[PDB]
Design a protein around this ligand. Structure first.
Ligand SMILES: CC(C)C[C@H](NC(=O)CNP(=O)(O)[C@H](Cc1ccccc1)NC(=O)OCc1ccccc1)C(=O)O
Ligand SMILES: [Ca+2]
Ligand SMILES: [Ca+2]
Ligand SMILES: [Ca+2]
Ligand SMILES: [Ca+2]
Ligand SMILES: [Zn+2]
Length: 316
């Protein structure tokens, strides 16, 4: 909408107060004009028609329970935009400052979130399996990274290319969580999963097998569920990325860690310059090795650690 940029205040899903960029024109809207062509957050009003209505509020204060998922979808989209711009010199998900659109209160008791090719969508959860999923900065950045992938490699969402697609979203979701530096970890979704259970999460990058996901190519899922295991076999690539950053010895293979910033640079370059819609795991290894060669040199530690990490998870 056309209006003047303002700053509201509210509480997120976890009860934390934050300021949010809004727009005033009769109402205060969840429209952040400070980032690209805008960040826009919508109310889907428990239906599945999208996007719903641009979020409007009478007083620019967002402290109601119903407001909390919108506050966090809006704010964490902004943090994710800031990460890609400041760290990778990428302007929004298309590299040309495309408007970022999110809808919250999607359906009733919906235990998921997604990028639909046009916008981000967040369920509220059923209150037992999940609380509203925009409360997780790693989840929000996971979804926005699917959009980045859509405009770059275009990894098909099936089998190995889909598991790379998923792992890319978990990797950059986690790197955004570290960027914001509030309780960062290598787990996915811990802030919104199972409010009745402390210490768990949807997935672990540091130890995927904690939640039954494979951590070695020899243990990959080969059936048809989950689009051929895209959220299962992502564990193999997530573990490799974790090893590249943090190091460790895994199935007897030692990896020298090179840190999160270099992990992000290597995988961002792989995603944007080498991966294609049908890339498989072996091709991802080749893209990551080439990317680290470009950035650090063929004889570099960084290149050696990428090779070790893929060796450790059985990907040649
Ligand atoms: C218990 C759950 C929460 C755990 C897991 N989900 C996630 O970890 C986060 N959602 P997510 O993985 O982001 C989304 C999943 C989806 C797919 C289809 C329909 C609805 C939801 N995919 C997604 O948005 O794909 C984007 C894409 C679009 C086009 C091409 C390629 C990818 C699960 O769904 O099992
Ligand atoms: Ca209000
Ligand atoms: Ca965390
Ligand atoms: Ca996390
Ligand atoms: Ca929990
Ligand atoms: Zn995903």
């Amino acid at each position: 909408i056309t209006g003047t940029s303002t700053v509201g205040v509210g509480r997120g899903v976890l009860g934390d107060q934050k300021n949010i960029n809004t727009t005033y024109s009769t109402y205060y809207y969840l429209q952040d004009n400070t980032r690209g062509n805008g960040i826009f957050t919508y109310d889907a009003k428990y239906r599945t028609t999208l996007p719903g209505s641009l979020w409007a509020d009478a007083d620019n204060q967002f402290f109601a329970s119903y407001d909390a998922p919108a506050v966090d979808a809006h704010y964490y989209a902004g943090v994710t935009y800031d990460y890609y711009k400041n760290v990778h010199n990428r302007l929004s998900y298309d590299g040309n400052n495309a408007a970022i659109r999110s809808s919250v209160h999607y359906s009733q008791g919906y235990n998921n979130a997604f990028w639909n090719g046009s916008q981000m969508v967040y369920g509220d959860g059923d209150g037992q399996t999940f609380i509203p999923l925009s409360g997780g900065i790693d989840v929000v950045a996971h979804e926005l990274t699917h959009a980045v992938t859509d405009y770059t490699a275009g990894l098909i969402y099936q089998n190995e290319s889909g598991a790379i697609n998923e792992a890319i979203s978990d990797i950059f979701g986690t790197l955004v969580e570290f960027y914001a530096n509030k309780n960062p970890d290598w787990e996915i979704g811990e802030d919104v999963y199972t409010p009745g259970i402390s210490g768990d999460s949807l997935r672990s990058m540091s130890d995927p097998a904690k939640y039954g996901d494979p951590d070695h190519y020899s243990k990959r899922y080969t059936g048809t569920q989950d689009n051929g295991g895209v959220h299962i076999n992502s564990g193999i690539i997530n573990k490799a990325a974790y090893l590249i950053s943090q190091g460790g010895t895994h199935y007897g293979v030692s990896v020298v860690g090179i840190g999160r910033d270099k992990l992000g640079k290597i995988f961002y370059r792989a995603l944007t310059q080498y991966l294609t819609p049908t890339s498989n795991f072996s091709q991802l290894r080749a893209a990551a090795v080439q990317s680290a060669t470009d950035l650090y040199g063929s004889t570099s530690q960084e290149v050696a650690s990428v090779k070790q990490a893929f060796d450790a998870v059985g990907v040649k």
